[PDB]
Enzyme design. Structure first.
Site, PDB file in Angstrom:
ATOM      1  N   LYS A   5       0.325   4.274  -2.294  1.00  0.00           N
ATOM      2  CA  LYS A   5      -0.834   5.156  -2.198  1.00  0.00           C
ATOM      3  C   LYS A   5      -0.444   6.562  -1.762  1.00  0.00           C
ATOM      4  O   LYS A   5      -1.107   7.531  -2.140  1.00  0.00           O
ATOM      5  CB  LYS A   5      -1.883   4.557  -1.256  1.00  0.00           C
ATOM      6  CG  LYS A   5      -2.477   3.242  -1.755  1.00  0.00           C
ATOM      7  CD  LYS A   5      -3.271   2.508  -0.669  1.00  0.00           C
ATOM      8  CE  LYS A   5      -3.659   1.105  -1.139  1.00  0.00           C
ATOM      9  NZ  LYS A   5      -4.085   0.213  -0.018  1.00  0.00           N
ATOM     10  N   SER A  17       0.796  -1.221   0.000  1.00  0.00           N
ATOM     11  CA  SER A  17       0.000   0.000   0.000  1.00  0.00           C
ATOM     12  C   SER A  17       0.831   1.275   0.000  1.00  0.00           C
ATOM     13  O   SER A  17       0.255   2.359  -0.148  1.00  0.00           O
ATOM     14  CB  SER A  17      -0.901   0.057   1.228  1.00  0.00           C
ATOM     15  OG  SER A  17      -1.804  -1.022   1.263  1.00  0.00           O
ATOM     16  N   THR A  62       1.143  -3.222   3.620  1.00  0.00           N
ATOM     17  CA  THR A  62       1.132  -4.584   4.153  1.00  0.00           C
ATOM     18  C   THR A  62       0.669  -5.527   3.055  1.00  0.00           C
ATOM     19  O   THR A  62      -0.508  -5.521   2.693  1.00  0.00           O
ATOM     20  CB  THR A  62       0.210  -4.701   5.368  1.00  0.00           C
ATOM     21  OG1 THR A  62       0.561  -3.706   6.337  1.00  0.00           O
ATOM     22  CG2 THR A  62       0.350  -6.082   6.012  1.00  0.00           C
ATOM     23  N   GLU A  66      -3.889  -7.241  -6.760  1.00  0.00           N
ATOM     24  CA  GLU A  66      -2.890  -8.110  -7.386  1.00  0.00           C
ATOM     25  C   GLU A  66      -1.461  -7.679  -7.066  1.00  0.00           C
ATOM     26  O   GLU A  66      -0.555  -8.521  -7.037  1.00  0.00           O
ATOM     27  CB  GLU A  66      -3.097  -8.177  -8.901  1.00  0.00           C
ATOM     28  CG  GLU A  66      -4.359  -8.913  -9.315  1.00  0.00           C
ATOM     29  CD  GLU A  66      -5.625  -8.079  -9.140  1.00  0.00           C
ATOM     30  OE1 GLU A  66      -5.531  -6.830  -9.140  1.00  0.00           O
ATOM     31  OE2 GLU A  66      -6.716  -8.679  -9.009  1.00  0.00           O
ATOM     32  N   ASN A  89      -8.461   0.685  -0.520  1.00  0.00           N
ATOM     33  CA  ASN A  89      -8.077   0.032  -1.771  1.00  0.00           C
ATOM     34  C   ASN A  89      -8.935   0.487  -2.942  1.00  0.00           C
ATOM     35  O   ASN A  89      -8.415   0.756  -4.029  1.00  0.00           O
ATOM     36  CB  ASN A  89      -8.152  -1.482  -1.615  1.00  0.00           C
ATOM     37  CG  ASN A  89      -6.883  -2.057  -1.054  1.00  0.00           C
ATOM     38  OD1 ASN A  89      -5.803  -1.510  -1.269  1.00  0.00           O
ATOM     39  ND2 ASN A  89      -6.994  -3.171  -0.349  1.00  0.00           N
TER      40      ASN A  89
HETATM   41  C1  LIG Z   1      -7.010  -6.342   1.882  1.00  0.00           C
HETATM   42  O1  LIG Z   1      -6.331  -6.604   3.007  1.00  0.00           O
HETATM   43  C2  LIG Z   1      -5.566  -5.549   3.613  1.00  0.00           C
HETATM   44  C3  LIG Z   1      -5.459  -4.265   3.190  1.00  0.00           C
HETATM   45  C4  LIG Z   1      -4.704  -3.366   3.942  1.00  0.00           C
HETATM   46  C5  LIG Z   1      -4.102  -3.800   5.116  1.00  0.00           C
HETATM   47  C6  LIG Z   1      -3.379  -2.945   5.883  1.00  0.00           C
HETATM   48  C7  LIG Z   1      -3.292  -1.489   5.553  1.00  0.00           C
HETATM   49  P1  LIG Z   1      -1.554  -1.118   4.927  1.00  0.00           P
HETATM   50  O2  LIG Z   1      -0.553  -1.485   5.976  1.00  0.00           O
HETATM   51  O3  LIG Z   1      -1.416  -1.936   3.640  1.00  0.00           O
HETATM   52  O4  LIG Z   1      -1.471   0.098   4.591  1.00  0.00           O
HETATM   53  C8  LIG Z   1      -2.866  -3.466   7.034  1.00  0.00           C
HETATM   54  C9  LIG Z   1      -3.007  -4.781   7.326  1.00  0.00           C
HETATM   55  O5  LIG Z   1      -2.589  -5.235   8.280  1.00  0.00           O
HETATM   56  O6  LIG Z   1      -3.693  -5.572   6.560  1.00  0.00           O
HETATM   57  C10 LIG Z   1      -4.213  -5.089   5.485  1.00  0.00           C
HETATM   58  C11 LIG Z   1      -4.946  -5.926   4.747  1.00  0.00           C
END
Ligand SMILES: COc1ccc2c(CP(=O)(O)O)cc(=O)oc2c1
EC number: 3.5.2.6
Length: 270
Positions: free
Chosen positions: A50, A47, A214, A145, A109
């Site tokens: 972003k 992420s 993550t 993806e 997302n």
């Molecule tokens: C779709 O599944 C996800 C989406 C984001 C996260 C995030 C937010 P980010 O750390 O990517 O910014 C932390 C997490 O622990 O699980 C996630 C799981």
């Protein structure tokens, strides 16, 4: 090279306890001193793209007045997992600025994908990063993806050094105009997803903005931040992790500990 050798041993011990690879680049914007550990290796962005996505939107808003206020309507099919803000406005739409804030501050997302579409997809975001002098960053795919984090795969990766260098240009340098720069900083400052990462290493009286990532596989997670200690120039740093096995879990505590080591290496009393 001095500060990097100062922390080489503790970083090796930390990543061995973690069971993977830790990549760190930290820059003291006052002295120019830097701390590097695996700083030129590629790690999946997850992420963390972003943040750069919102910066690219802000850059376009300098030439397209009213871009930020444009309403975007979307369908249920846009709501992929982890769209905690955009799912609440499915029946109403959201503005480009609201999507950008949701992408930065909640890692939304659906919002990220909607904004990627406005910029021309992954190649459009990559083009923006090239335009500020980042030749390392590459985004190739969309959410979700891009989370595959396959060992050795350069898709959807950058290096800790390039992330820090681009973050510096966007938050402290001249890559954005002054109002857009402050908006980017403010979005990072308001992030809600990083309390256990770099922020866990930062004293309460220092300002900090961050963006997390993550991937959910291959022990792959990250955070980048700008930190404003009191009485000295800001620090920019990036902390990325990965691990060899798909089932390896990421560790927020490891990210926080790596941030602590980077700050200690720079001599910033934390
Ligand atoms: C779709 O599944 C996800 C989406 C984001 C996260 C995030 C937010 P980010 O750390 O990517 O910014 C932390 C997490 O622990 O699980 C996630 C799981």
């Amino acid at each position: 090279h001095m500060l990097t050798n100062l922390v080489a041993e503790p970083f090796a011990k930390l990543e061995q306890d973690f069971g993977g690879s830790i990549g760190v680049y930290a820059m003291d914007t006052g002295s120019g001193a830097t701390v590097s550990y695996r700083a030129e290796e590629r790690f999946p962005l997850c992420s963390s793209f972003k943040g750069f996505l919102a910066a690219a939107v802000l850059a376009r808003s300098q030439q397209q007045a009213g871009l930020l206020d444009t309403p975007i309507r979307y369908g249920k099919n846009a709501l992929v997992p982890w769209s905690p803000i955009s799912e609440k406005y499915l029946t109403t739409g959201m503005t480009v600025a609201e999507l950008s804030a949701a992408a930065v501050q909640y890692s939304d997302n659906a919002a990220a994908n909607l904004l990627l579409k406005e910029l021309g997809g992954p190649a459009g975001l990559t083009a923006f990063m090239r335009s500020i002098g980042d030749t390392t960053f590459r985004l190739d795919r969309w959410e979700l993806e891009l989370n595959s984090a396959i060992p050795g795969d350069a898709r959807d990766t950058s290096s800790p050094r390039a992330v820090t260098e681009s973050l510096q240009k966007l938050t402290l340098g001249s890559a954005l105009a002054a109002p857009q720069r402050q908006q980017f900083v403010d979005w990072l400052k308001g992030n809600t997803t990083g309390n256990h990462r770099i922020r866990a290493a930062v004293p309460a009286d220092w300002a900090v903005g961050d963006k997390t990532g993550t991937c959910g596989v291959y022990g792959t997670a990250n955070d980048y931040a700008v930190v404003w200690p009191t009485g000295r120039a800001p620090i920019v740093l990036a902390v990325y992790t990965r691990a060899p096995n798909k089932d390896d879990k990421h560790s927020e505590a490891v990210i926080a500990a790596a941030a602590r080591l980077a700050l200690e290496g720079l001599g910033v009393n934390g």
